[model samples]
Target chain A: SSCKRHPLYVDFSDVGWNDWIVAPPGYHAFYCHGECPFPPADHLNSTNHAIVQTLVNSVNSKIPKACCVPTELSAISMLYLDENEKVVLKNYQDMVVEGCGCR
Target chain B: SSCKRHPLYVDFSDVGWNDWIVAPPGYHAFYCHGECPFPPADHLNSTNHAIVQTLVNSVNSKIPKACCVPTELSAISMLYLDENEKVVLKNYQDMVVEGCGCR
Candidate 1:
């Protein structure tokens, strides 16, 4: 199967962080998974290096092919209790996946 | 040096597209270029796959390290003349670099 984004909701309560974190109980932090075939497609957003690596892997069995990963990400704002017991609202970078590609 | 974004203004005029592309002359389409060291830093926005690949490459020299590439991109609107000599303004996706990272 080709690389693609999959749904994945990360709930703070599931990881035992519900107490510290307030506001949204969870978020849709999607994930990327799947195979990266040789001669990557146009939508993969593949780099020249990835293309070369894929070509090399095709010729030589030892070298591995480029991986499928999150090529683009977005941030999320979180409201949490700080160490001083004060509530703080902060923005976290690279928290949500926006796009995936062979890299 | 770690992966980073660099300035790169792509002028359509330079590519002999001045006649067709009638707006703004050119646009700043930055690029990403750098090395991906093992155990990529926090600012690199590296994926787990890249980290594992880096670790594997450290043990075996035959395997190559994960590559540095544009992790985020933005769109740009362009005004151009079509084959019918009609002026058209359209938005092009993934035309501008927003961030860089190892993948």
Candidate 2:
């Protein structure tokens, strides 16, 4: 299934859940499939690469490796290579970062 | 962050992944952030609400509670409701189903 399969790393870009905006229009969360499930587990983790390989690489590099933080919700975004090598939202910053506990 | 998080419960609509079409163009797999974690755990789960609630609800209801199914590839789709009361793709039947082992 390696070379035989259509290993195309497609990107799933969805600007969802921002501080004031909830997911940009026409954006959707896409999954990736390869040795692992498309849309890697939890928040898609990416290798930051030597540099930002892609916007996905840069963003995934910025998020905390999934955890319970004492601070209020924060905003972060990153993209991961979906195996096919396409990009996908890795760590999309939750928009609730700046709110004062009040919507 | 209850009523404060613009809790509109908007649904994440995306007909991504199928046995043939790998994520429809312009369609992305949107994440659902709720008490469990937006996009809900590894895969979103939902309740019946005594009726059909989550496509995330029904599909989450359909999936075998997640597992390594030793069977050949199969197709499954599910939906779940984000705490905001929005629906999200809970499960997507991998379109790669039915292909011969050659695939």
Candidate 3:
């Protein structure tokens, strides 16, 4: 069946609501792996400097259909400081651009 | 009639889609005025210091129901730096917490 031929749904146990990006259907972490469509997350401007690098190296692989969920975008934090107060690498998903009749 | 007295519905010409906060019906900016139920917008933490004072002074009057329209929340920016790089005061709305089976 066409449904079966379509990609078997993969659920990422690691990504919680805060990390989700509600983009259009079939959208993947195209930018996470390569040239992204949007700008770096705000931490790129952080004065500490390494946050810029940490986020730049952070990669988001194969965004599941769940990221395309029909919902309002939620405000969330991406930066996490270690015990030393250094930027820890994270797999931050980009902001969702659109949804049903909404942008 | 109850419809006749429903606050006469006002639309803020100054507020565009970005300024909108999609909360439940009748949810005026309960926090933007006094003893807000949530935290201040991020500009409150800007390193320039006075952003703290400016945001503390920012106020939102009656919510005018438009903020309650059923739609997914959109990410928006607030702070606008002047020639002095001083944080200019702006009426930054609080982030929307929920709407139509989505948060």
Candidate 4:
């Protein structure tokens, strides 16, 4: 199968963090998971380095193929209670997956 | 030298596009250039695939090392004249490089 983004909703309550987070009970923090075949396809958004590595892997079978990972990520704003019991609004980087690719 | 972002200003006017582009004659579309040494450092933001590839290259000198490339990019808004001579505003994605990594 090709590498792609998959749906994954993370609920704070389910992880026992509902009391701390005031807003956004949960977020759609999707994940990237799948096989990264040799000579990754164009849709996989692979880099030239990965392509070369794949070629070497095919020649010598000892080298490992590239792995599928998040290529693009977006930020998410969260309102939560800080350690001082103060309501704080902050932006977390790399929280949501936007795209996947071979690395 | 390590992999990192370098300054690069692309001037549309210099490229003979002064009449078409109305606003922002140039932009800082940075580039990524450098070496990806064996066992990529943490600052390079390399993935597991690159790491493994590096190890294989270390064992076999014939294999090539990973390359440094753009890891994160941002969008830029541009105002230009369309083919119909109408002014249009557009947001171009992946126009500016924000980070670089070994791939």
Candidate 5:
């Protein structure tokens, strides 16, 4: 794999534990293949861009808001990307650690 | 927080560097607060189900596949929840770690 990989930058500076109101939607993580190309000057709109899988335990709202915190019962999301860079979300079995408190 | 969390399990053992297909959609992680009220017997379809925040470097597809592996440029996503237990995805800035290769 000669592809060194370069990731595209997305801003989440506004999202925090307290400032969850103005935060964007969910969380997003993307990267560009070797050398990194700006498909749309700032993002990998298309072309050789790739997306990752994610999950969460809690957030601000029930529909979708900001800062989704992790509780002891939270598990990990086992997911993959679609053909067009779309997010294909899935569910993974209890990928959690018990005992240790969230600090 | 007083409320000890219990996370719902989602299986991703099917997802791997090889078995990307047949795996699941993307990744899903959920949890139940205070006793984990099973809204649907096995899952928290409603009631008091909470989702956490997650981001990945890669999975498996371009539009909707499986296992989008991480490259050097991968990053983290920042997100939160709405009011209806829905997942709201957002983007974060470049969260890369230089030097160390993916082991």
Candidate 6:
């Protein structure tokens, strides 16, 4: 039997309770690897500089909202950083744009 | 006839296609005011020190992953700053945790 693949099924059970102030909708992250959910459990690894470089190299010393996210168009981070867990703090804010809608 | 208030309704019409790296689920934000939710309109605001202070205050300069979010127990930010919006840049990532499950 042949099956025609259809659009992925999404579970948006939580909408009214969501808080998506930044992200527009359906924002996805392109992992370093090809295309796959986060890698299975694995030992710790180094961090990336691109993340930090993006923040540090920012035009203003003090992070700005406009320069933060929703860059109209994807302005890939010219710079790159190592892989570090700590880096999340600097970018976590703009990291998750769409709210789960689970109040 | 009687009427009872119910949980807020969110539109997660977009899931599956969503990418929620952080944020567990059912995370909501309490606006500065009562329970009105983000003001319809807003104005320009100045920057604050508390934002930078926290990042600078972080025990680790690089910002550890563990300390990224879900601090086990609501680790209320001790340092409070002005109504600065730019500060959002540093926290936007974490601001919208639960990614809109929009497929």
Best by DockQ: 1
Q: Candidate 4, B16: how far from true, in Å?
A: 41
- What fnat does each of the candidate structures reach? 0.07, 0.00, 0.00, 0.00, 0.00, 0.00
Tens digits of lDDT, candidate 5, B1-103: 2122222233334223123323233233322223222121233221111211122212222311111121223333534444664555655343322111111
lDDT of 1 by residue, A46-92 (tens): 76445544554565545456566777888888899999989999987
Taking all chains together, each candidate's TM-score versus the true structure is 0.52, 0.15, 0.17, 0.49, 0.14, 0.13
Report the CAPRI category for model 2. Answer: incorrect
**Per-residue alpha-carbon lDDT of model 1 for B7-94, expressed as tens digits?**
6665666545588888868777666667788655776687654554565456655545666666787778878889999999988776
Among these predicted structures, which one has the highest TM-score?
1
Question: Candidate 5, which CAPRI tier?
Answer: incorrect
What does candidate 2's lDDT look like per residue over B53-75, in tens digits? Answer: 11122234331111111112244
Better of 2 and 4 by TM-score: 4
lDDT, candidate 2, residue A6? Answer: 17
Docking class of 6: incorrect
Candidate 4 Cα deviation (angstroms), residue A5: 0.9
The order by descending lDDT is: 1, 4, 5, 2, 3, 6
- DockQ sort, best first: 1, 4, 5, 6, 2, 3
Candidate 2 global lDDT:
0.24
What ranking emerges by TM-score with the best candidate at the front? 1, 4, 3, 2, 5, 6
What's the lDDT for all of these models? 0.69, 0.24, 0.22, 0.68, 0.26, 0.19
Best by lDDT: 1
Q: Give the better candidate number (2 or 3) by lDDT.
A: 2
Can you tell me which runs of candidate 2 are displaced by over 4 Å? Answer: A1-75, A87-96, B1-103
* lDDT measured at residue A47 in model 3 versus the true structure, 0 to 100: 17
Steric clash pairs (candidate 3): A72-B72
The reply for model 3, stretches above 4 Å from the true place, is A1-84, A100-103, B1-37, B40-102
lDDT of 6 by residue, B1-103 (tens): 0111112211112222113212222233111101111211122121111122122223333311111111011211212223552222122222222211001
Q: Between candidates 4 and 6, name the one with more favorable DockQ.
A: 4
Cα displacement (Å) at residue A66, model 5: 8.6
